[PDB]
Amino acid sequence: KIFSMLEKFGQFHWFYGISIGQFLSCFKRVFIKKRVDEILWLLYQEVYCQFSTALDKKFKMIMAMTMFCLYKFDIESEQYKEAVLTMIGVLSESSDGVPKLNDDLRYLWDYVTTKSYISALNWFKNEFFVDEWNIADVVANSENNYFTMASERDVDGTFKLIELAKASKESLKIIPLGSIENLNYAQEEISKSKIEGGWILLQNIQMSLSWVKTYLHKHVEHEKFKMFMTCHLTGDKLPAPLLQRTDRVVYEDIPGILDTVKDLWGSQFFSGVWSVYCTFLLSWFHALITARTRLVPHGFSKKYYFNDCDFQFASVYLENVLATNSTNNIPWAQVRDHIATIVYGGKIDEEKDLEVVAKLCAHVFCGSDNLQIVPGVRIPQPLLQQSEEEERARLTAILSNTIEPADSLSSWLQLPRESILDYERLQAKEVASSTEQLLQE
Amino acid sequence: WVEVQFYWLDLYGILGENLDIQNFLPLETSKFKSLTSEYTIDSLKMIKSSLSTFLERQRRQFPRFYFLGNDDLLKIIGSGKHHDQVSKFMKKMFGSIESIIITGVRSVEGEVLNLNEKIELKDSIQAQEWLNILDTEIKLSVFTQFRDCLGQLKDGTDIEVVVSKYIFQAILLSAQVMWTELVEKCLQTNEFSKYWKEVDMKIKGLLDKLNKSSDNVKKKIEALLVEYLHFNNVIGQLKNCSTKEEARLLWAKVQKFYQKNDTLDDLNSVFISQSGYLLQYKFEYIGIPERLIYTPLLLVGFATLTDSLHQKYGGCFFGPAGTGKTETVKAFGQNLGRVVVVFNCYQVLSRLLVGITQIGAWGCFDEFNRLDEKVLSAVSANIQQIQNGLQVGKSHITLLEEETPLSPHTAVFITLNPGELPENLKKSFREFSMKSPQSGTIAEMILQIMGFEDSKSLASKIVHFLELLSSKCSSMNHYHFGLRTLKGVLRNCSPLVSEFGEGEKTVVESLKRVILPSLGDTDELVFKDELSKIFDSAGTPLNSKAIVQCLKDAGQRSGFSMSEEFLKKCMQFYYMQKTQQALILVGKAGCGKTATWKTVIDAMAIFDGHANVVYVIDTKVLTKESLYGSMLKATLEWRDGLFTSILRRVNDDITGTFKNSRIWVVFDSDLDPEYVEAMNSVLDDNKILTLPNGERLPIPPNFRILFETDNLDHTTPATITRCGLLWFSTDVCSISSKIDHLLNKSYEAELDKLKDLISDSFDMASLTNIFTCSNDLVHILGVRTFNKLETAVQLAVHLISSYRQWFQNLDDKSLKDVITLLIKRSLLYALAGDSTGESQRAFIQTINTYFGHDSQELSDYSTIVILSFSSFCSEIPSVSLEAH
Ligand SMILES: Nc1ncnc2c1ncn2[C@@H]1O[C@H](COP(=O)(O)OP(=O)(O)OP(=O)(O)O)[C@@H](O)[C@H]1O
Ligand SMILES: Nc1ncnc2c1ncn2[C@@H]1O[C@H](COP(=O)(O)OP(=O)(O)O)[C@@H](O)[C@H]1O
Secondary structure, eight states, X not given: OHHHHHHHHHHHOTTOOOOSHHHHHHHHHHHHOOOHHHHHHHXXXXXXXXXXXXXXHHHHHHHHHHHHHHHHHHXXXXXXXXXXXXXXXXXXXXXXXXXXXXXXXXXXXHHHHTTOHHHHHHHHHHHTXXXXXXXXXXXXXXXXXXXXXXXXXXXXXXXXXXXXXXXXXXXXXXXXXXXXXXXHHHHHHHHHHHHHOOEXXXXXXXXXXXXXXXXXXXXXXXXXXXXXXXXXXXXOOOOHHHHHTSEEEEEOOOOOSHHHHHHHHTTOXXXXXXHXXXXXXXXXXXXXXXXXXXXXXXXXXXXXXXXXXXXXXXXXXXXXHHHTOOSSOOOHHHHHHHIIIIITTSSOOOHHHHHHHHHHHHHHTTXXXXXXXXXXXXXXOOOSSOOHHHHHHHHHHHHHSOOOOTTHHHHTTTOOHHHHHHHHHHHHHHHHHHHHHHHHO | OHHHHHHHHHXXXXXXXXXXXXXXXXXXXXXXXXXXXXXXXXXXXXXXXXXXXXXXXXXXXXXXXXXXXXXXHHHHHHTSSSOOSSSTXXXXXXXXXXXXXXXXXXXXXXXXXXXXXXXOOOTTOOHHHHHHHHHHHHHHHHXXXXXXXHXXXXXXXXXXXXXXXXXXXXXXHHHHHHHHHHHHHHHTTTOOHHHHHHHHHHHHHHHHHHTTOOHHHHHHHHHHHHHHHHHHHHHHHHHTOSSHHHHHHHHHHXXXXXXXXXOSOSTTSEEEEETTEEXXXXXXXXXXXXXXXXXXXXXXXHHHHHHHHHTTOOXXXXXXXXXXXXXXXXXXXXXXXXXXXXXXXXXXXXXXXXXXXXXXXXXXXXXXXXXXXXXXXXXXXXXXXXXXXXXXXXXXXXXXXXXXXXXXTOEEEEEEXXXXXXXXXXXXXXXXXXXXXXXXXXXXXXXXXXXXXXXXXXXXXXXXXXXXXXXXXXXXXXXXXXXXXXXXXXXXXXXXXHHHOTTHHHHHHHHHHHHGGXXXXXXXXXXXXXXXXXXXXXXXXXXXXXXXHHHHHHHHHTTOOOOHHHHHHHHHHHHHHHHOSEEEEEESTTSSSHHHHHHHHHHHHHHHOOEEEEEEEOTTTSOHXXXXXXXXXXXXXXXXXXXXXXXXXXXXXXXXXXXXXXXXEEEESOOOHHHHGGGHHHHSTTOEEOOTTOOOEEOOTTOEEEEEESOOTXXXXXXXXHSEXXXXXXXXXXXXXXXXXXXXXXXXXXXXXXXXXXXXXXXXHHHHHHHHHHTTXXXXXXXXXXXXXXXXXXXXXXXXXXXXXXXXXXXXXXXXXXXXXXXXXXXXXXXXXXXXXXXXXXXXXXXXXXXXXXXXXXXXXXXXXXXXXXXXXTTOOOOOOOOO
């Protein structure tokens, strides 16, 4: 039954294709780690802890809930079967009625009544699947040497692999592509690391999929050698023989906003006080728009992808504006228009997204006497007797002391709570419908 | 032998004649000398492949010669003494110069340029040296025209005398410069009315000069008035600004032109400012090309292109077709005084790309999504390499595995039509999505430049009318209501103003003449209702009695019927061939197309007294090689195709008849894009024919091209919009009209009494009943009865003609019965002759019950023997077949 469910997952998307030798090796790991009920529980726990990290968050929740449902359907009675079925139905708003009356089931009904859909979905992992796996646990408990780390856009695993290499004290080599010189350098580095070992990083190989078809099929036990390649979940299809011979890892984008601001401002290494203040505001706005990007049903209407390139171009534009102004009168309207209708609206092909981006620009680049960028904290205007280092210290201090609230997706992005609750309800409906399609078939 | 001799003479003129060029390939030149002394084709081809490195060095000597292939370039090199074959192919060099006048050069559209000084010519001068000298000379001529125009304008001289002497480019950018300076001087104070009035009287005086000018002066003046309307609009907007912040923002958004007053250089002395962003003017001659009407969204596109190109990253457009991306790119490029090459969608593409990156010009890609995976990947990799080399500031780039120099001003532009580019391109490109351009502003400014007294209101009305047409009419394949159709309508308004005058009537009449032929029937009624409801003019009928009388005379001469639908189609074809050159006639099968244009030919031959020559040609019957030509690769021999032979014979004009006659070449077959893209150069306003050998055969103005087709599923909208499209919604006749025309035709192919009896016997009362009864009958290979009337007539009248030898010895009743029986048999074997036997007997019963019981009832096996009415039972001959 578990293998049938995983075959369905592999049929849903081209990245989830699960082999059979992997399943048998996971079953071997069940006994390796340290009566029939205990063996079955260890089977379920080990299979989830091995095959969760090869899926995205939505399919993670789907597989967790389906595994809990199958275990409770086989172990518990018919009343709990009907209760679980009707809770899954009311999650998708298909079956209406209270479950038959269990402390944990009462907690589920309390969470459903309070419309906390993400907590209801994560309750299964909170209750049954106690153990969790990160990227380090996957790479440490893997016998292979070739790894694929795919993810969505608006995020990258370069810093995560940097942290992993620092943790393992291994010299990593990030190899960007784009030129035949880059391809030759990557080939030479591969031919070197196939002898002397070492961790080698490959990034955004979907554009070089043709080079993959040319070289990797013909190419594919050294110590401290693990080849990493990064793909995109929305990209082109990778070859199946390449995918079956490697371990698959999916990374999740961070949910915070202040962390993004800190990460952006920690790389803007320097133009005096005004340039630094402009770069600070630009980092805040890039973080806010990147946070609003993922909210596809309500905040936006289409999943755009604002990388750091448009932030860099906006920084260049602000530098050029600040250079040609000796009167200390910043043209707020000009920079607002250029950000709204060229920089962060050039790729936009819809009117409503342009209007909301312009509204956010007016909210951020107003240049008021005392701006309230978020309801939590207010950034005062700089004074007229400061150098660059004093302003940098002041901005870092005013960045550190801020508190990220639990409603950052509503208060900081200026959205009604009903929209976010509707988005979460739609996600719950999708998860429940998918797990029903897994159940009845 | 001939090919070897020609190649030997060409290579001798290339390498043997000139000295000190054989050092790069000494062994190859020695082999060439040995084969020349011996005189082979294979050795010559191998040498010319080995001479590509020498050819590459030759193209590196003057990079502007790279734009041609091997054959054209070797033709250029061989004719290095007579100073010929170079000026003829000058169009492919710069795109805005057609020929060389050394006194000067002449533009593609027809503008002459005068050099600052003459350049000495000798028979021992290689092409590259004087080509580069001519390029420097024309650039310096543009610079000195800039400086003397600035001196004259700052002196106080009016624009009307400057515009009549210098080039449009110089006066245009001088007016831009002085407009920037005086708007700045107005910005240092709070006064804007005086410069607004000054540019207003400047526009009015330029219009007064325009209305009595020649063709080139009219084009140049319009190309100046578009920017002067821009200046008027900008100053009017700046005057309307409440605060100085809005004025500063609007002035930073729009383009500004500045000239450095301290740099000793000339080409690096004029820069363009927009929101603090600097771009370098190139000062390349462009002539008087098409100037886009300026809109605020055009300025936004200009601003985002400038913002992208400041950081050494090219621009990239994407959006629905018809929003004006490629024309926006072209206007931006020629606004900087440089020519942007245009790619229409691998070896030739990569060669053009490496030539672009080694010349430093701009590359524009149109409709990027029609490439295969391999060529798309290779082109994306090449563009990524070029752009990374530009970003890294590399003097040379490793593009296509050759070391070629990289200019810092090279840019690549790509347009897309989504409903995509790879990851590497989008990592190094900026995307812009323009909306629907304001057709109100374009229409208003083109109407103001055409002198319409009511411009804004009429433009709003016409764009609202086009929106209503697009939102109400059917969703046919060939229906285009974008900006192309509006621009074509307002262009075709130009010849109509001499008879209808400026105002609503000319716009309504041109709207009819352009839109109405291309619509169906319910679409035509919707168009008429919307035109009556929105526009005030009711469309009074003009005085055209002579032409309709001539059409009626030609129709009665050829036996045709003058039904009002046929008159409407004839008038549409005549008014559409008055202006448009290449016409397309579309309708159902056998709906009266060839008859229509033949009637038009006869009628206006009568009307004008002008001779007509017709060359009927089927498109699909002849192959591509036989239609135009076939370069015989065995000996590089040229065999002229039928159309090209006709064009050469009409260009030669040995008899001199074609100087006083009209020549039509119809194309009576289904349209093939492979057969129409080969003559796209004839299609547009260029009116020139390209050939595989490179000849540019001109087309006389009376040399018309026609197309006849039954469908438009396999025809591109590009040729549809450029052609005048005539649509036959229904048949142009009645059944009685066609039956009478066929009877008259076969009569031409007691005789008067017989003709009267035949014409009276085809009484429409029972004929319509039996025709609508047979229309409900199942016919194999189902064709309309309108296509069976021909069979019916040609069978019946031939039977009567063959039986005419026994028509003087029988009674009137017997003759009537014989005629009726023959007619019944003919209509049986024409209408229901393609149906089953039971249905044939049913149609026999229907004929008998619908022609009356008094008439002779035709039996299922009846016949006439030599005369009496017999049955087919008696004519069966018994056969005695043998054993084996
Ligand atoms: N008044 C008329 N106007 C037009 N056609 C007529 C008229 N009277 C008769 N005809 C018929 O039109 C025929 C001429 O061909 P027609 O123009 O109808 O075909 P077509 O549409 O050009 O054909 P194709 O589709 O094969 O190219 C004549 O043979 C005749 O039978
Ligand atoms: N400012 C302008 N002036 C004149 N025509 C314009 C302007 N902007 C857009 N157009 C129109 O854009 C249309 C062509 O652009 P488009 O169809 O996008 O090119 P492509 O088909 O190569 O994508 C033409 O109808 C042209 O009239």
